[PDB]
Design a protein around this ligand. Structure first.
Ligand SMILES: [Fe+3]
Ligand SMILES: [Fe+3]
Ligand SMILES: [Fe+3]
Ligand SMILES: [Fe+3]
Ligand SMILES: [Fe+3]
Ligand SMILES: [Fe+3]
Lengths: 164, 164, 164, 164, 164, 164
């Protein structure tokens, strides 16, 4: 039997599908960067795409642990182009902030229903989001300082390309 | 410059998107097996999904290697209910044979264009598809013999759950 | 001096005595499985009883850490017979869900008094209960599928008898 | 089929229930010592409680080896306060002497019925009780010599707190 | 941009400054124990001072992770004398209990604002405060028993002198 | 009995308090660097803060060795903002030169009193100050040759961020 409410299960399943899209978005960002000749930034992006899939799978497994099931939905076509390296990371930041609020919304729902199990489950993602958001801010800081000097982009492309 | 034709690039890009769908389909099968309580079968499908992403990425990197660009498209909602275990693996077989034929179509397009580089590149996938098809046929034969007997199905689930 | 309220101390002390009873219940189930000749299912229950004792001792030590004292109460006689293996596990699931509600009630009490220390301490048990319920549900679902088939029950007894 | 008589089975099951009570009593002594701030003496009592459970389980397994079954009974509420350290260890000594006589009584019953298997089984307990009683008498001797001197009691608490 | 509200940033920054003062208060207790010839108690306080700096640095880094900034404020002159060993440790407990309440107030502010990230972040401190308080209470219990007997105070000085 | 003069004790205690302020000043410089997004310069400043505390503790311990006592004083609020990276390191150099003269004044005081123990003790700090001043001058040299070029400033930030 399912021990989560249908509302909570729906919220969790919706969030699973959002992490799938997050993954796919970051893959397309990789497509952009590769097309611009920045293999390091693209490498970063491929690595992030994989990280998002681990988030999806954490939701996946918790749904089953509470006796629900997952239903996968259509994935929307992401953007494939950005107006420059900074434009893409600003998009990444705004996406991650949106994911954080989505998670927050599930937390508040669960808390309202006195579903302490789901509330506790979500702590991990609250904490991870802090780091996801921070990593993109740091990159934007470094890009802001670089002011388009290939010299610096070459080392910072190199640097993000050493990820993992 | 791009040194594949736009027709070939499009064919390869379409197949990249097909492999992403394959990955998602196998994940959907995993959602089914997990809902039905077969974690071994679900495990096998999760590994298979991961494998399909590696195929997608081989297409990805070849496209850039020949000067082209990748454009990610919408992914269709996969089916989530099968009549039973054997029906889900039968659908997997059918899907792999469809992918094989998709690959054959690119290969024939490339040989027509004398794009020997792309022809040589696809050989890996022709060979890999033979193995992919064979693995599912083997499971199907076991499941035909089990003839719905739970005791045998349980053994198969445990064995497929050992997939590395 | 005691830094928890007497209301929260009593709630914690009550839960400690409930975890002792849990332990005893599982030992009782081991008596039943051993009477029926299922040494592997009995082993599992013995290990489960020991696990419940570690939960009791976690409450014990937290009560003292907040300046309170533990008072052990009488332990009720558990049932000692069930209507087969599946019935025993059904009872075990109902007991665990009852334990989860008991933890929830303490959590809600402590929250209402702003006893953040106790709220935080109780997170571990919320998370543990998710796993405990899930382990029983997994066993039940296997048993549902087995439909009393002795070959499947033998293999399950062997597997549960491996529990560390 | 049960090879022990119902009378010997009842005596063995009674004694298993008595050993469970012994465990619970020593845990209660630990609650007292922890309340008084003697964590070493409390640790000694927790280890003793664990030891008593091993005794219960030795009775358990022999009952099943002879084709009988265990029925767990309610556990009486133990005392939770003593007049001082000596008072608590004196209560432990008295309890152990009572357990020794309880085992003697089973031995005498088994011997009257010519149940040589059960007589032989009980030798381990006769021997173990010698050591159990001696251990408490040793501690009492040292407490008698300490005569309320805290330098000496600190050392004793520390030592008993190293019990493996 | 700063993710945290200015009210929450202020609260966290004020606490960082409180933890710096805690550090310095414990160094001051070391200066007292060193003046009294208790190098072990002084060692303990030097270790506790170092621990409080790790706390401050945890706030520090969280503030920057949320896009805020730290401002270091003047540090008040701590007391430099106590009326005896117990007196100093009683002052340490009162201080720690004040620190716990300060933390609780941040947590309640953050919860009111639905700043789930900061609420989550503070759990570590709620748990750590339980242990900080407990360790000083334990010391105070021992000192109470020692009751000014120098042979027992020597024992405790050597013990606390072994803090790593 | 104290075998340093009260004048020398007071000068040494003043200097211990000056080293504490040095520590705090470097932590404040770290707050600025972190606010400006230079985590490597911020790391170096944190490590510098820690080193200054080791200096304070060397004064601390010598004072106790000569039979004196340490009295901790209020610590002034440090500046938190500079006009750029070079401005901060110039302010660090100026501070260290001031600390050097502070040490020199104690040395001269101790010499006038024929306190050869204290003169000798202070030689360590004379030599260390030569090295602390050189450390900062080297960095200021590297910042001058960077000449505002971000490529180079990033190599220096990462490098100073390796400090152990
Ligand atoms: Fe994510
Ligand atoms: Fe494929
Ligand atoms: Fe439990
Ligand atoms: Fe015993
Ligand atoms: Fe602290
Ligand atoms: Fe210094």
């Amino acid at each position: 039997m399912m021990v989560i409410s249908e509302k909570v299960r729906k919220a969790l399943n919706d969030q699973l599908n959002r992490e799938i899209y997050s993954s796919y978005l970051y893959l397309s960002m990789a497509t952009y960067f590769d097309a611009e000749g920045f293999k390091g930034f693209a490498h970063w992006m491929k690595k992030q795409a994989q990280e998002e899939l681990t988030h999806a799978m954490k939701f996946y497994e918790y749904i089953y642990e509470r006796g629900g099931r997952v239903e996968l939905e259509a994935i929307e076509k992401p953007p494939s182009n950005w107006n420059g390296i900074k434009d893409a990371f600003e998009a990444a930041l705004k996406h991650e902030e949106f994911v954080t609020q989505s998670i927050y919304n599930i937390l508040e729902l669960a808390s309202e229903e006195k579903d302490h199990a789901t509330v506790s489950f979500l702590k991990w993602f609250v904490d991870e989001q802090v780091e996801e958001e921070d990593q993109v801010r740091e990159i934007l800081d470094l890009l802001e300082k670089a002011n388009g000097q290939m010299s610096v982009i070459f080392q910072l492309d190199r640097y993000l390309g050493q990820r993992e």
